[PDB]
Write a structure and sequence with these properties.
The protein has one domain: Retinal cGMP phosphodiesterase, gamma subunit (Intrinsically disordered gamma-subunit of cGMP phosphodiesterase). Helices cover 5% and strands 0% of the residues. The chain is built from 1 helix and no strands. The structure holds ligand RCY (9 copies). One copy of the ligand *[C@H]1CC(=O)N([C@@H]2CC(C)(C)N(O)C2(C)C)C1=O binds next to loops.
Length: 87
């Protein structure tokens, strides 16, 4: 019968859940990664981004699985004002 009962609980959490939350049009519309969300300045390197090809296999995995900016949220090279979330 379907997969075995999933761990839909995890008590490890505590206050990092609940509270005033109201999604919007559900998560972004993927199924077509191209240029429907990523937009700003012409394609280049560093200033803009990098222009990879198939992330999750060669784009990233080290500065995220071992040290993700979410932990030491303070260093960050550029774009430090994005800390307010006013994005
Ligand atoms: C799955 C297990 C779990 O509980 N996780 C963490 C820790 C708590 C606080 C329990 N969560 O709800 C989050 C997702 C933050 C898991 O990732
Ligand atoms: C409300 C919906 C939600 O889940 N939110 C965030 C992100 C996750 C990890 C799903 N949470 O349980 C918290 C509350 C941290 C919301 O903003
Ligand atoms: C984006 C909220 C940016 O300021 N919020 C989100 C998440 C990241 C990846 C940081 N972004 O640039 C978008 C807009 C997708 C702002 O800081
Ligand atoms: C299709 C939509 C998208 O952007 N995406 C991401 C989601 C995660 C799991 C973060 N990832 O590494 C991929 C590239 C799969 C999709 O699967
Ligand atoms: C370098 C190649 C590229 O287009 N890019 C974008 C992709 C997303 C995840 C939208 N983004 O915010 C960056 C700047 C990473 C690269 O990383
Ligand atoms: C945002 C839109 C997108 O798919 N993208 C690419 C750019 C690079 C860094 C090559 N990459 O692996 C992602 C998926 C982030 C953006 O810059
Ligand atoms: C660069 C390519 C990518 O999508 N990615 C992950 C890493 C974490 C921080 C887990 N994450 O939510 C994104 C989508 C940025 C990279 O390391
Ligand atoms: C940055 C590095 C990474 O992969 N990551 C995870 C952490 C949670 C909140 C579980 N998540 O869905 C992302 C992809 C953001 C980071 O904090
Ligand atoms: C530290 C905590 C966090 O997740 N974060 C954002 C800031 C930007 C650069 C917008 N981003 O994509 C991450 C996830 C690093 C912080 O400033």
């Amino acid at each position: 019968m379907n997969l075995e009962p999933p761990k839909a609980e995890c008590r490890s959490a505590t206050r990092v859940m609940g509270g005033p939350c109201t999604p919007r049009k559900g998560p972004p519309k993927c199924k077509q990664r191209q240029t429907r969300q990523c937009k700003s300045k012409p394609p280049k390197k560093g200033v803009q981004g990098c222009g990879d090809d198939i992330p999750g296999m060669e784009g990233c995995g080290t500065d995220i699985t071992v040290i993700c900016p979410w932990e030491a949220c303070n260093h960050c090279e550029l774009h430090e004002l994005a800390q307010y979330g006013i994005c």
